[PDB]
Tab-separated table of C-alpha atoms and ligand atoms in Angstrom:
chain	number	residue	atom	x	y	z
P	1	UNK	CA	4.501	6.388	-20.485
P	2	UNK	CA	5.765	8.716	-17.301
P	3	UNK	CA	8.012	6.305	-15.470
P	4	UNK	CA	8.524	7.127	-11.980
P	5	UNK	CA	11.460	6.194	-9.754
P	6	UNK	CA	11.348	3.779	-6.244
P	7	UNK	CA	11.559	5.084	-3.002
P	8	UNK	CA	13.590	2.679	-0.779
P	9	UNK	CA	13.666	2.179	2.959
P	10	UNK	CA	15.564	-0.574	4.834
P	11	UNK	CA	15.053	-1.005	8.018
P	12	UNK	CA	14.234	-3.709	10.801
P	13	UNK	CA	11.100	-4.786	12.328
P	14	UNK	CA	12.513	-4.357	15.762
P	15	UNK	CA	14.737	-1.827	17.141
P	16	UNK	CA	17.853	-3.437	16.249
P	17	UNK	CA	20.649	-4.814	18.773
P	18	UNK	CA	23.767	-6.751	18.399
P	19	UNK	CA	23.125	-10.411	18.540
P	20	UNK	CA	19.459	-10.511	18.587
P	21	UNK	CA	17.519	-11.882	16.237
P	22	UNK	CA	15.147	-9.267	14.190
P	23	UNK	CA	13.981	-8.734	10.587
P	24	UNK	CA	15.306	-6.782	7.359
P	25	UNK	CA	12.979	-4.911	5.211
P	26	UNK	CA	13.427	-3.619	2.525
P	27	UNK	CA	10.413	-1.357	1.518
P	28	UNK	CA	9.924	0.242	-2.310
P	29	UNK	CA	7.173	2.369	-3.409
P	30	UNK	CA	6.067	4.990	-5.856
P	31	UNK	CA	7.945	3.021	-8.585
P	32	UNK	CA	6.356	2.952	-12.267
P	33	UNK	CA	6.009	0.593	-14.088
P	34	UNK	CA	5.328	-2.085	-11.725
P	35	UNK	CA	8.420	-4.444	-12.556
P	36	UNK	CA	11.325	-4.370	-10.254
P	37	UNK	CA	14.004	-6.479	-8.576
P	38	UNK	CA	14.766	-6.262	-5.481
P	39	UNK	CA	17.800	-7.935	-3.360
P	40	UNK	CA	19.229	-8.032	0.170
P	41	UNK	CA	22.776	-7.877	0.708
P	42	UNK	CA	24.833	-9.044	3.311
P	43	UNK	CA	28.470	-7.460	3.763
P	44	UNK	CA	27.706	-7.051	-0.314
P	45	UNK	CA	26.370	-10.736	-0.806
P	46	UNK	CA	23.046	-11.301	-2.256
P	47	UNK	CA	20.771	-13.158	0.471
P	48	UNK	CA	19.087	-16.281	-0.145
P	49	UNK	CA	15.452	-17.065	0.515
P	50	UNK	CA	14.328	-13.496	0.615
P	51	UNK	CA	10.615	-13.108	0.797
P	52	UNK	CA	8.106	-10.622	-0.791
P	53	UNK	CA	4.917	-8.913	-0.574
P	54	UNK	CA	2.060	-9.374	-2.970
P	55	UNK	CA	1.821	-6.223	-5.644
P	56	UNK	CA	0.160	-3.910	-4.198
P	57	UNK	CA	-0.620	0.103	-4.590
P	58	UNK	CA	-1.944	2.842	-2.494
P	59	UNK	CA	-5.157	4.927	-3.104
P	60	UNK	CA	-2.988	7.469	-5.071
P	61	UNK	CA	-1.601	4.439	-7.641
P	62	UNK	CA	2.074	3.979	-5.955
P	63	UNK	CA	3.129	0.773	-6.377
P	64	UNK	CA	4.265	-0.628	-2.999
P	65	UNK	CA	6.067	-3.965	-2.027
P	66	UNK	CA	8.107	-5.182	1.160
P	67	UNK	CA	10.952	-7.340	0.632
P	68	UNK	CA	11.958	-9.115	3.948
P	69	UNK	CA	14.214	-11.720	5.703
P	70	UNK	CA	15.080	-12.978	9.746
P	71	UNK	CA	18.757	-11.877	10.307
P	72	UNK	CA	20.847	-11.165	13.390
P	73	UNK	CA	22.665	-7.904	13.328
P	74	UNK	CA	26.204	-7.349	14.797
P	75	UNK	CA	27.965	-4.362	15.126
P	76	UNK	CA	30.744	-5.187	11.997
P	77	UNK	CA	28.148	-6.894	9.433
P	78	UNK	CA	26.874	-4.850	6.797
P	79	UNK	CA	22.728	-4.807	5.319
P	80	UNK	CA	21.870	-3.142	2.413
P	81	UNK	CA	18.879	-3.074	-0.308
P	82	UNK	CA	19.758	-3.420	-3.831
P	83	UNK	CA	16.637	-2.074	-6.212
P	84	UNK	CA	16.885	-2.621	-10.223
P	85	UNK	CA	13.982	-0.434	-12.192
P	86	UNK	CA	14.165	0.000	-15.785
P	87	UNK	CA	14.498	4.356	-14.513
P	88	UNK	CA	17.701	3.199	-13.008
P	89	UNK	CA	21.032	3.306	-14.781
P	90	UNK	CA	22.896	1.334	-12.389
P	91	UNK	CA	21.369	-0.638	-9.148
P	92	UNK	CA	20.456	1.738	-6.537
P	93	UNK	CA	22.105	0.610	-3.293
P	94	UNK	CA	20.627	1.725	0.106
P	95	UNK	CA	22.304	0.724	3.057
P	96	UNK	CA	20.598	-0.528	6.470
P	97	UNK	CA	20.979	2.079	8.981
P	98	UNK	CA	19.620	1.143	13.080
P	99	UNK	CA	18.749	4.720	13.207
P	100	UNK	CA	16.831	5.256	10.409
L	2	UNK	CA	-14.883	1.024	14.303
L	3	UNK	CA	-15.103	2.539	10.947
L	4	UNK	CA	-13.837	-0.248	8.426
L	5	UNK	CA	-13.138	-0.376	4.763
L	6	UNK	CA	-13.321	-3.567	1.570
L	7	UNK	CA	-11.057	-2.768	-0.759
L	8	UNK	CA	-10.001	-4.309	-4.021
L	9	UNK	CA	-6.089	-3.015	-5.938
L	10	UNK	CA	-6.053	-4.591	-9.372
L	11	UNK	CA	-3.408	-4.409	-11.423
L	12	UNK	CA	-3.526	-5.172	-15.466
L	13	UNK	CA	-0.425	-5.484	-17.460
L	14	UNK	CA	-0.243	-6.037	-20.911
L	15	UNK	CA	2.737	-8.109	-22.218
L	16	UNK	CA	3.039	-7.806	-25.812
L	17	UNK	CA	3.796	-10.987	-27.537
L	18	UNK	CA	3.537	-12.910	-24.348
L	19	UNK	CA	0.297	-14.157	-24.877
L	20	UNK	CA	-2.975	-12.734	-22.049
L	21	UNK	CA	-1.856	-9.364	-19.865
L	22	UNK	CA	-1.111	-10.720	-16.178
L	23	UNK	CA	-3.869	-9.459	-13.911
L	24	UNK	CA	-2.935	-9.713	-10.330
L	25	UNK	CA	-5.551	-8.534	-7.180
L	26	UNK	CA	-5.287	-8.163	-3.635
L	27	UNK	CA	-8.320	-7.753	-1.118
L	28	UNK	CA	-7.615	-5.837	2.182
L	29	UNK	CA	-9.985	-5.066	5.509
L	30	UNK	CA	-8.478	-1.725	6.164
L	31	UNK	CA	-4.861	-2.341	6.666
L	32	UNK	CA	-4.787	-6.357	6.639
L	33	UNK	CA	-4.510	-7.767	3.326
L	34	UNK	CA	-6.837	-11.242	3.366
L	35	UNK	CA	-6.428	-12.700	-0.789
L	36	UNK	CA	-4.257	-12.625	-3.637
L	37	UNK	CA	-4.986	-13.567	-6.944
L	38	UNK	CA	-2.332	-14.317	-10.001
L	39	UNK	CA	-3.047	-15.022	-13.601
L	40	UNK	CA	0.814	-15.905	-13.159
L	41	UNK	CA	1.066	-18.565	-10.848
L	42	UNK	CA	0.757	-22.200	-10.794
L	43	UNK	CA	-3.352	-23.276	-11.258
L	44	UNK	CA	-4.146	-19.723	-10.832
L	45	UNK	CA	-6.731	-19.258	-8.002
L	46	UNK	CA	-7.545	-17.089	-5.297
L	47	UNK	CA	-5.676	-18.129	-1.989
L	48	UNK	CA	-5.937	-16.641	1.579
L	49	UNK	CA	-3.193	-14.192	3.387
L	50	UNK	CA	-4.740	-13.796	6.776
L	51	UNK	CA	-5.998	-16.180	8.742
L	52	UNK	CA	-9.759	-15.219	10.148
L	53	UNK	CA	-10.030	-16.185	5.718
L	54	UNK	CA	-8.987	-19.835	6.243
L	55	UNK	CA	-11.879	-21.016	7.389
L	56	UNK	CA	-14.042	-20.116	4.050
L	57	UNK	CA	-15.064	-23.329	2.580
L	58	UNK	CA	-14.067	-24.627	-1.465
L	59	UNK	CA	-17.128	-22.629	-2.608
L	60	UNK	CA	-15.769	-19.799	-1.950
L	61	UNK	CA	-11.977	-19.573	-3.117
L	62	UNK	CA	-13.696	-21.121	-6.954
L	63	UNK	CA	-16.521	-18.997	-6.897
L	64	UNK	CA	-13.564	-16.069	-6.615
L	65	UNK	CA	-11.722	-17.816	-8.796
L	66	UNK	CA	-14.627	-17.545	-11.908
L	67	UNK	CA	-15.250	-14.006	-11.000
L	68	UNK	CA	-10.985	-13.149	-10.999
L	69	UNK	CA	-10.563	-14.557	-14.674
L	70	UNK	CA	-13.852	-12.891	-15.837
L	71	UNK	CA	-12.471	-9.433	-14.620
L	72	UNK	CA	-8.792	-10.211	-15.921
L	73	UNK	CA	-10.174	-10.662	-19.740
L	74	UNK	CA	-12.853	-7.174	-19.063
L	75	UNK	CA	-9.323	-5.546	-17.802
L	76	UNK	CA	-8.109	-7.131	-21.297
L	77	UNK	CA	-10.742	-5.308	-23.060
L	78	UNK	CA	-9.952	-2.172	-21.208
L	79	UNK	CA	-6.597	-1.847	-21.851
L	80	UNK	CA	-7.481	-2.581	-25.473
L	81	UNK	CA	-9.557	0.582	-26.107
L	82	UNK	CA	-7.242	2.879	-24.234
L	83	UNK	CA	-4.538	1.747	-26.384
L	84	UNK	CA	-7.138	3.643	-28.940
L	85	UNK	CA	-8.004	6.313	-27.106
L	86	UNK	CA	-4.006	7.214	-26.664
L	87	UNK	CA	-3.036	6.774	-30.532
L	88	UNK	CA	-0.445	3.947	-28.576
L	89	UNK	CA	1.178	1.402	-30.759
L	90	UNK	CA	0.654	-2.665	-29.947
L	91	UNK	CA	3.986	-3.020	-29.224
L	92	UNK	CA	4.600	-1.044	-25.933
L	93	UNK	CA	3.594	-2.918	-22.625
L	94	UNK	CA	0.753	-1.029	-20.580
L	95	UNK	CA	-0.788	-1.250	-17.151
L	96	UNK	CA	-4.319	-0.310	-15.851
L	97	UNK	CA	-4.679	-0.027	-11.847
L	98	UNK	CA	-8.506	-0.135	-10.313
L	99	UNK	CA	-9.785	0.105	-6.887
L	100	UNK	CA	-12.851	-0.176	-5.328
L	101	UNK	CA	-14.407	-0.396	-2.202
L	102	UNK	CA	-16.699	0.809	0.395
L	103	UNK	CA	-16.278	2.375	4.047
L	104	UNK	CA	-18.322	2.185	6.426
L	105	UNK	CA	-18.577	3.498	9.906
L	106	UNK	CA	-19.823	1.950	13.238
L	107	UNK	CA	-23.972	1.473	11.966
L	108	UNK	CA	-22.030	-0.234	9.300
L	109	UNK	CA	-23.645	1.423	6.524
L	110	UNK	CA	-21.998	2.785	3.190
L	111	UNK	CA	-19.924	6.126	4.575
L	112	UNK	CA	-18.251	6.233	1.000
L	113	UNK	CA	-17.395	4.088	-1.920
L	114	UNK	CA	-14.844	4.463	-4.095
L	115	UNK	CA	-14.357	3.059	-7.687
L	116	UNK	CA	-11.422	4.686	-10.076
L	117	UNK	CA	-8.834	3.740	-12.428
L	118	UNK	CA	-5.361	4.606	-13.629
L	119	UNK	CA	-4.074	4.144	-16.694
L	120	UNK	CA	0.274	3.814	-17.225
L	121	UNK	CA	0.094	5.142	-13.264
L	122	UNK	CA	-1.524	8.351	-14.128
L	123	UNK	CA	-4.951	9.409	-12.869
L	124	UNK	CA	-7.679	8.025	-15.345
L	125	UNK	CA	-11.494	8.326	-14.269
L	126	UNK	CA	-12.702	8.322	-10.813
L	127	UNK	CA	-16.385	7.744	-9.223
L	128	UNK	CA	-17.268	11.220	-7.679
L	129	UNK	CA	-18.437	10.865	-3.935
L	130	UNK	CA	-21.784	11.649	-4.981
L	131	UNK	CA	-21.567	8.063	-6.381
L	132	UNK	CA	-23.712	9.399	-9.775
L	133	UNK	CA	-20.869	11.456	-11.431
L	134	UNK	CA	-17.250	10.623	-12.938
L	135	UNK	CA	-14.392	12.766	-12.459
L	136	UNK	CA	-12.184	12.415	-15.918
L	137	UNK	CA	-8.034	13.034	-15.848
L	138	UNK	CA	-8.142	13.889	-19.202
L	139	UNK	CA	-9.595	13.840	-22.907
L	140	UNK	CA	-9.460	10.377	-23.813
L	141	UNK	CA	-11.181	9.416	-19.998
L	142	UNK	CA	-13.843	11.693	-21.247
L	143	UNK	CA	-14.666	9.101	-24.018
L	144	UNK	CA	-15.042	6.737	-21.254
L	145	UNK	CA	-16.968	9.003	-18.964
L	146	UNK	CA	-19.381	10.095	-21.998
L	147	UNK	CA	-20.099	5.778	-22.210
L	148	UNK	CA	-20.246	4.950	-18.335
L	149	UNK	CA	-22.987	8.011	-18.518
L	150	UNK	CA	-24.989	7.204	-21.783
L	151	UNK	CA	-25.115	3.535	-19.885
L	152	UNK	CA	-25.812	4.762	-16.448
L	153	UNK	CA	-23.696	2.344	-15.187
L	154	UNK	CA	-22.844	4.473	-12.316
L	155	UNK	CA	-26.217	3.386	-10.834
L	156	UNK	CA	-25.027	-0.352	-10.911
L	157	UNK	CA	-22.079	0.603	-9.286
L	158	UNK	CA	-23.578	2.556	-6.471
L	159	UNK	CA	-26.096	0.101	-5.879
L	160	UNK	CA	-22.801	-2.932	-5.524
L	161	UNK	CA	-20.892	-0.154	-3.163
L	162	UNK	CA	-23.988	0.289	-0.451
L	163	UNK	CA	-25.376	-3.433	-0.998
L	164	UNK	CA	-22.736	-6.452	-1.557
L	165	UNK	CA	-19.463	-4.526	-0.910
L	166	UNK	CA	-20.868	-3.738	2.617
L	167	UNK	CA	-22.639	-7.392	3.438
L	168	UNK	CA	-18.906	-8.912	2.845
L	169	UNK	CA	-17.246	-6.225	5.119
L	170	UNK	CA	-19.334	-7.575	7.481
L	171	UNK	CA	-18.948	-11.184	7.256
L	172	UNK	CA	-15.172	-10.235	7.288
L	173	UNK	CA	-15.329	-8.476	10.474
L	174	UNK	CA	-17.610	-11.036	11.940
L	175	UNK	CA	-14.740	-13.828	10.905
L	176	UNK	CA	-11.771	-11.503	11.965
L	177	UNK	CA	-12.959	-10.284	15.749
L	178	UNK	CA	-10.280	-8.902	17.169
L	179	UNK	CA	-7.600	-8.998	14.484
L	180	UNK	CA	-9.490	-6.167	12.256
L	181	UNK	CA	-11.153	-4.545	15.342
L	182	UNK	CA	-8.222	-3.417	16.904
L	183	UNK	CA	-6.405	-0.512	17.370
L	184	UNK	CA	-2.649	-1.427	18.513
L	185	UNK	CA	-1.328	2.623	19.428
L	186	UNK	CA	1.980	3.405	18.776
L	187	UNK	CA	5.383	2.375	21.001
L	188	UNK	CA	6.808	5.684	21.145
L	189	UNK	CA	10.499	7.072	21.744
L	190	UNK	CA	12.692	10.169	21.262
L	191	UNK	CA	16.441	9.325	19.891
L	192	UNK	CA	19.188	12.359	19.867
L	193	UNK	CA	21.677	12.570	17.132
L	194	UNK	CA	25.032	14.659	17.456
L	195	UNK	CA	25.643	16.487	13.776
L	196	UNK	CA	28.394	19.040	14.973
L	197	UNK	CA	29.123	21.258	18.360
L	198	UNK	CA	26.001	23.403	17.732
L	199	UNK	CA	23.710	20.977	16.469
L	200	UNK	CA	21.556	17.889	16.754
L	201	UNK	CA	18.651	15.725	15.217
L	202	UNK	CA	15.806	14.493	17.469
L	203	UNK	CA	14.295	11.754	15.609
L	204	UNK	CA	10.747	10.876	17.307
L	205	UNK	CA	9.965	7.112	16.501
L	206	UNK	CA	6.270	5.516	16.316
L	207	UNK	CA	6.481	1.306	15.846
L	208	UNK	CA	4.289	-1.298	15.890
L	209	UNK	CA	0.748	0.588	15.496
L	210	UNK	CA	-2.365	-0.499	13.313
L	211	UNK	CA	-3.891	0.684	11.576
L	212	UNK	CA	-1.272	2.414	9.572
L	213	UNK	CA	-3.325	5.930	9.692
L	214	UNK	CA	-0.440	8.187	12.339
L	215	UNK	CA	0.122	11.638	12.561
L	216	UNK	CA	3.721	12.497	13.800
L	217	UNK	CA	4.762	16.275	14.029
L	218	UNK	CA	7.415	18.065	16.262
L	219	UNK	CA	6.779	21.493	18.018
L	220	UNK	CA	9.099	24.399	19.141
L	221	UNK	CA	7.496	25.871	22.189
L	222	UNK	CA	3.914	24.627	20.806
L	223	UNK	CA	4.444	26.301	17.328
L	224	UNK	CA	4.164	23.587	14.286
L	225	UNK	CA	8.057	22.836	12.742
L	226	UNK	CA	6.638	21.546	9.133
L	227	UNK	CA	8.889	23.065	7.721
L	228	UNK	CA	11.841	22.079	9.347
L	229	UNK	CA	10.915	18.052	9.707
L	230	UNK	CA	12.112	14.916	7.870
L	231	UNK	CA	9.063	12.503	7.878
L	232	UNK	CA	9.794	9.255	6.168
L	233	UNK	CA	6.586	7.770	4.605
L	234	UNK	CA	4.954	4.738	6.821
L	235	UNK	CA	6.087	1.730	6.023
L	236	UNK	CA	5.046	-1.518	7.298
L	237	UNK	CA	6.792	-3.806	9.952
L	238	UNK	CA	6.100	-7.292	8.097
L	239	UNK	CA	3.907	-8.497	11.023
L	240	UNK	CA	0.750	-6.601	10.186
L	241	UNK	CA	2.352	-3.480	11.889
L	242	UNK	CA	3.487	0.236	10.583
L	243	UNK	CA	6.349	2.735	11.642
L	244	UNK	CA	7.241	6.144	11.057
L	245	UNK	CA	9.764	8.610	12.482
L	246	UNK	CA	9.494	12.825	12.433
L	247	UNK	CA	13.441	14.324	13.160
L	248	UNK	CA	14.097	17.804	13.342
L	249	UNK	CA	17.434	19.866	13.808
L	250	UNK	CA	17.748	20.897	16.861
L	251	UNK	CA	20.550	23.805	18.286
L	252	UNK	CA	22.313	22.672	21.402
L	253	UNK	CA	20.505	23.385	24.562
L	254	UNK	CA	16.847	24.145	22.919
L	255	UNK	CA	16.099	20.306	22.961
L	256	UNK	CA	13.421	20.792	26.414
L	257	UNK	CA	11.604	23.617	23.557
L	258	UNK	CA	10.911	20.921	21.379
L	259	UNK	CA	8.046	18.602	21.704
L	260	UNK	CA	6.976	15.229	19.767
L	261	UNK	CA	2.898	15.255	19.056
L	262	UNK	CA	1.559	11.016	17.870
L	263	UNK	CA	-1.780	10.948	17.012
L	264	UNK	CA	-3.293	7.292	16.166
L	265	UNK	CA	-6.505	5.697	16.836
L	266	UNK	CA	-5.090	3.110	19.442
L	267	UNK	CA	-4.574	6.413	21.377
L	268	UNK	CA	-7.270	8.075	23.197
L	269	UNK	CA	-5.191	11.692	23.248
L	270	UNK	CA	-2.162	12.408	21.005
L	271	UNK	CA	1.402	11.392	22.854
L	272	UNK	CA	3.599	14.541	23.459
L	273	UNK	CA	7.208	13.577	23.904
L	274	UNK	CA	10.482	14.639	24.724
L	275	UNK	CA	14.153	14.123	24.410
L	276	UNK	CA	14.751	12.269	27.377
Q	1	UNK	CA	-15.373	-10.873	-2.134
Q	2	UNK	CA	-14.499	-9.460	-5.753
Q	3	UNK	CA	-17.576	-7.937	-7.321
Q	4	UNK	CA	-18.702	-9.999	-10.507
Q	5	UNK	CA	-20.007	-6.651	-12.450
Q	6	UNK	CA	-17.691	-5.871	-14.752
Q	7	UNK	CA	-17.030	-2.559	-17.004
Q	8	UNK	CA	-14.995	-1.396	-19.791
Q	9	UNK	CA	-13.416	1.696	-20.427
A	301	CL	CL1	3.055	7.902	4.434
């Protein structure tokens, strides 16, 4: 089998600001095969009680799921996405970014 | 509107792990309504929208019967392509199907769609003629010579413009105004120093549905394809999308560019600007 | 709802 590598994007629901409460995604797709783990970090801590999407795939077969929790950003606190795949020698960390 | 039923599948053998896991979602266009999980604890169909919640027992068990019926056919499946590809019994395998019909505002069939993937490569396809297969390769040409000999796509044709289409409509009927909608786009232009001589204009769309969006930048009208960064939509977790275009931009020549959002929640494309 | 034709490959 072909095995393909995740996309990630992290990323709120809201256009982030300091001290207001929002929501952290953390979006893979075009992963193959269809297992993966995926965690949210806080200031390099795994977060607790992270929810998930249902597998899913687009019309052209890419794998797809959303990986989400509430959270407050501040300006010091750090978010990223943490993605293990069996194409991935070590965990692929993607930071959050407000402007991206 | 024009609307779509579809149905993802996904089939994964597990070898020594007893039956492959079969998983399926349902969506009305962009709103996901069921999921179904050979996994999970008394495995049955269960509702992820709420226009669904008001179907009675009937209907979640009479999913039910037909969701383990199509997990052990997927079983079967996955079983002769494992012949067709010479593959050992020892690797683990996946086979991805979707169906579905679209239909526009009369509400009749527009087109259906019916195709498979086997290990996430293309497999066979139902043409749009809905009477003709399109194969990836030699070993989906064994299953395209069957599907013919058995005229099965006749069957299929005949589910895609009768049932597929009568439960789109129920659907509709239950959802109103939570599938009928268009919610357009909240649009805005952020500007991003790189050095003296240089910035990014990233043009944001959030919080539209359906997830459909076009986002391009212009330089004095002419297209910039080129010369964009367009992340791939990606959904907001509350039944919403986003997506941003950003383009380099040389100090001074940011009133040249122009931001272009086309969506079906707007009547006319938005043009922006750094503002 | 999921059709209840089913197919083999
Ligand atoms: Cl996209």
């Amino acid at each position: 089998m072909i095995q393909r590598t995740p996309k990630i994007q992290v990323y709120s629901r809201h256009p982030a600001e300091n001290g207001k409460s929002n929501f952290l995604n953390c979006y893979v797709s075009g992963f193959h095969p269809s297992d993966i783990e995926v965690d949210l970090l806080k200031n390099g801590e795994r977060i607790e009680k992270v929810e998930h999407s249902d597998l899913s795939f687009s019309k052209d077969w890419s794998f797809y799921l959303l990986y989400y929790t509430e959270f407050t950003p501040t300006e010091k606190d750090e978010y990223a996405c943490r993605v293990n795949h069996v194409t991935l020698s070590q965990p692929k960390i993607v930071k959050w970014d407000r402007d991206m | 509107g024009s609307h779509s039923m579809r149905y993802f599948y996904t089939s994964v053998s597990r070898p020594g792990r007893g039956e492959p896991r079969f998983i399926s979602v349902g969506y009305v266009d962009d709103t996901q309504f069921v999921r179904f999980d050979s996994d999970a604890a008394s495995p049955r169909e269960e509702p992820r929208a709420p226009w669904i919640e008001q179907e009675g027992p009937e209907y979640w068990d009479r999913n039910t019967q037909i969701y383990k019926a199509q997990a052990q056919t997927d079983r079967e499946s996955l079983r002769n392509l494992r012949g067709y590809y010479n593959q050992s019994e020892a690797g683990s395998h996946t086979l991805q199907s979707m169906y579905g019909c679209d239909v526009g505002p009369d509400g009749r069939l527009l087109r259906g769609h019916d195709q498979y993937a086997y290990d996430g490569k293309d497999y066979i396809a139902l043409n749009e003629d809905l009477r003709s297969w399109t194969a990836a390769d030699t070993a989906a040409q064994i299953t395209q010579r069957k599907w013919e000999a058995a005229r099965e796509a006749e069957q299929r044709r005949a589910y895609l413009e009768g049932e597929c289409v009568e439960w789109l409509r129920r659907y509709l009927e239950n959802g109103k105004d939570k599938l009928e909608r268009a919610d357009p786009p909240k649009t805005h232009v952020t500007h991003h120093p790189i050095s003296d001589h240089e910035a990014t204009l990233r043009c944001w769309a959030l919080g539209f549905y359906p997830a459909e969006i076009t986002l391009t930048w212009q330089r004095d009208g002419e297209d910039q394809t080129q010369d964009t960064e367009l992340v791939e939509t990606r959904p907001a977790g509350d039944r919403t999308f986003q997506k941003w275009a950003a383009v380099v931009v040389p100090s001074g020549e940011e009133q040249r560019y122009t931001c272009h959002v086309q969506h079906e929640g707007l009547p006319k494309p938005l043009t922006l600007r750094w503002e | 709802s999921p059709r209840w034709y089913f197919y083999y490959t």
